[model samples]
Target: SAQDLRMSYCYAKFEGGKCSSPKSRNHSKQECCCALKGEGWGDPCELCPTEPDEAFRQICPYGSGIIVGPDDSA
Candidate 1:
């Protein structure tokens, strides 16, 4: 199985609704956020990289479709 990257905070918005997933590993965590063009707020994380990096896309194939990228202007 692919390694699970721990996500401190995760917020994702899709066509129908929004979703969030948070994972903790050890005693540390990483921030992650995703939203539609204008449905939500806050910056996304490398976990949800705009370019849809292989690492993330492979793990979160569905989320890659909606997760905002770094270039998205708030």
Candidate 2:
């Protein structure tokens, strides 16, 4: 599933606009690949891979590629 795969890849999960990464402090105001908040729970954010393949597209749309958060730079 896209969600499962994203979860495996993404290191940060934003809940209530807060980052879940232990290294969040190092990522303040950084741009990263992130899946927008759905009706589910948290917003999943990841470091942009060299190749954002099909599964990445399904999980994160074109416009959803860059998001500002405290969870690693893009």
Candidate 3:
């Protein structure tokens, strides 16, 4: 998994279970990093209006939660 957090947005989107493209058309949001892209695209993922790092940190918190036991203890 590309440890680079720039790709975190992709992780959030997919994890939440929403695919913007229903039939494989206009799937531009799949592009995670700005350094890469595929041909035959409509628009690109400049989708993260805020800074990439800030967006990632907001979406995927690093150290705020911990599981203390096997059941539901926190």
Instruction: Measure candidate 2: CA RMSD.
Output: 11.0
Could you list the CA RMSD of all candidates, in the order they appear? Answer: 12.0, 11.0, 13.7
Q: Sort every candidate by TM-score, greatest first.
A: 2, 1, 3
Q: How accurate is candidate 2 locally (lDDT)?
A: 0.36
lDDT of 3 by residue, 20-58 (tens): 322232222223222112211123223332235664334
Per-residue C-alpha lDDT of model 1 across residues 1-74, encoded as one tens digit per residue: 22454433334432334433322221111123223322122233222344265643444446533444445336
Output the better candidate (2/3) by lDDT: 2
Model 2 stretches with alpha carbons more than 4 Å out = 1-50, 63-66, 70-74
List, residue by residue over 12-61, the lDDT tens digit for candidate 2.
44554444543322221122343332222223433332235663454455
Prediction 2 TM-score vs. true: 0.25
What lDDT score is found at residue 41 in candidate 3? Answer: 19
What is the lDDT for 30 in model 3? 27
Predicted structure 1: lDDT: 0.33
| Clash count list over all predictions | 1, 0, 0
Best of the two (1, 3) by TM-score = 1
